[PDB]
Design a protein around this ligand. Structure first.
Ligand SMILES: [Zn+2]
Ligand SMILES: [Zn+2]
Lengths: 356, 357
């Protein structure tokens, strides 16, 4: 009966995943309506500006929603935003019970939806499959509760922890399946951060161009954030193809204004992350940068999760180190907790969380 | 579905053959089932060199009923009197109708002669059934018998950034205990573990098999420990010597070593050393547990069949000791591998890798 609740929530968790690339800055939310042990309404949130999962499920439910039980992965909202309050829609639909996975992470609003629900004499349960549900909105839950984005760092290295022989060669040690995987990480990110070096060396794009069974046009594209402190970004760079989705931290440049590039002031990495969240509503950040900037992020403790692609090759000791720090003692190691390792054809990928 | 019926029974035989993986060397892992009217009537594996063969055990169980039965066996039944009588003769004596064989036995003492003994008695022989699966059961033995070179697994452990110690040489607790315990398995199927003198002085390692998940260690046919020591620096107090009878040293002849019972090997190139271990000492599976230099030399000389790489979820930084210490100037020089698989061992991962050659 708790297990019954958990079963229904998991369904809502699965529906929530259906807007994964298209919801940002809004969260992923799923909702099921259950009447007499029967599924009678399903909804997810497809896109910021569109109806919330609850609205879509209640539409399906119809007058049948009366006395039913709604399961929603995130507390139903109580405030008008782009759309009306779900708490009220659920009051209007005259449901018996609401089962919530994640309370609203915004502490100014946490419980407000519950309060409306409880005052309408609707019973409420919170925390069911919270852990699983929270995996749907790592950036969102983090940013709304702490003001900082969830930051993922992508690194690609050899078996022996190296990335290149020489810099600026644009050589690849990882294969195409790993390329495909990177797309997923970009597609859930509000921004992809890199340093001018990568741009100059690689003419990289850092956008989302192919995801299996999804058309590009449905994807809420990450902003491309370039850290360019000396303003050496050439106007010819492929990244400037879609200038509206480019941010550039570096000296004010009139030529970049004329293209509509967002120009950010030079600020500490930590502050940059704060600015992206607060000003631009970027809650998921991905770093795809060379060793210096990657190492800086890691050493400044700014990485929530490292996504490490390892190619089955040895580059040898004089090849470029993936990580630039000069540690003297074993006690100085940056240890991580391993989440999982998967195979991507010839490469593997690890996801790693800092420990303390 | 005759082919399907055969594969079913052979797969059974292949399962029996996994039952003495640690105890068989230098002898092969071999499984055998005996099937009569689709009933399993006899079962056997080879437990240990000097002990009877899978076939004998399987035949003993089947008894009189083996007459007209089909024997499934993962390796060609043997044809010679070795430590024991020939199994092909035993199959002939039991009057089996048919013998289905996974792998031919390239052991020159057998090599088609068991098959031939059976054919000559009018027993049907089919060969090749689940060969690829069965071959996995004796990578070393089959390689050694048919080429004179052992199967060589290179073990390395490193941080994510490819480092094995600090610049000082401090190195404790990079990989964790599950990885360490996995190494036990690799040691236990190996005829020899090869290390260099530097490892012995630095770690005072033993490189034996001391624990194995859910296995009585008494069953383990211990690897020999092979120490490369060009200049004879091996201290007599080294822990690796507390069991001298299973140590071999490649270095200058020392009478104090001869007196402990240590096999002394002539200084020779690595390829030759590997052939020596195969042709002279019946070592068909080799595990290298050595430092950067010796490890890299085996790799660069093309002497590794499989690399087993343990990676810890940690970063030691750009000044820490490299796990692989060649210096390549060009990207084209990179040493490429094919990935067999990766698994998680608590917090470490383990990659198995086959050199691209
Ligand atoms: Zn809502
Ligand atoms: Zn035999």
């Amino acid at each position: 009966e708790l297990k019954q609740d958990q079963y229904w929530m998991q369904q809502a968790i699965e529906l929530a995943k259906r807007g994964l690339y298209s919801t940002k800055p809004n969260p992923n939310v799923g909702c099921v309506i259950v009447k007499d042990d029967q599924l009678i309404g399903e909804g997810f949130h497809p896109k910021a500006g569109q109806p919330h999962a609850e609205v879509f499920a209640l539409r399906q439910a119809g007058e049948q929603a009366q006395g039913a039980t709604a399961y929603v992965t995130l507390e139903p909202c109580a405030h008008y935003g782009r759309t009306p309050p779900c708490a009220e829609a659920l009051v209007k639909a005259q449901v018996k019970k609401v089962v919530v996975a994640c309370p609203d992470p915004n502490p100014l609003v946490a419980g407000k939806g519950v309060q409306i629900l409880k005052n309408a004499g609707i019973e409420v349960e919170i925390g069911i499959c919270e852990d699983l549900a929270a995996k749907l909105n790592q950036g969102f839950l983090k940013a709304m509760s702490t003001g900082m984005p969830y930051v993922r760092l992508k690194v690609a290295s050899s078996l022996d922890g190296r990335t290149a022989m020489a810099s600026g060669e644009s050589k690849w040690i990882t294969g195409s399946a790993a390329r495909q995987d990177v797309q997923h990480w970009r597609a859930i990110s509000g921004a992809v951060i890199t340093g001018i070096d990568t741009v100059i060396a690689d003419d990289c794009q850092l956008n989302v161009r192919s995801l299996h069974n999804i058309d590009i046009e449905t994807v809420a594209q990450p902003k491309r954030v370039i850290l360019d402190r000396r303003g050496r970004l050439p106007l010819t760079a492929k990244i400037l193809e879609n200038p509206e989705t480019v941010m550039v931290m570096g000296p004010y440049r009139q030529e970049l204004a004329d293209l509509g590039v967002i120009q950010l002031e030079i600020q500490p990495l930590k502050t940059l992350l704060q600015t992206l969240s607060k000003q631009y509503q970027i809650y998921d950040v991905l770093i795809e940068a060379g060793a210096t900037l990657s190492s800086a992020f890691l050493q400044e403790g700014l990485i929530d999760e490292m996504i490490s692609y390892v190619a089955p090759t040895l580059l040898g000791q004089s090849a470029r180190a993936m990580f630039n720090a000069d540690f003297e003692y074993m006690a100085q190691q940056l240890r991580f907790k391993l989440l999982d390792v998967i195979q991507l054809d010839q490469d593997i990928r690890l996801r790693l969380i800092p420990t303390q």
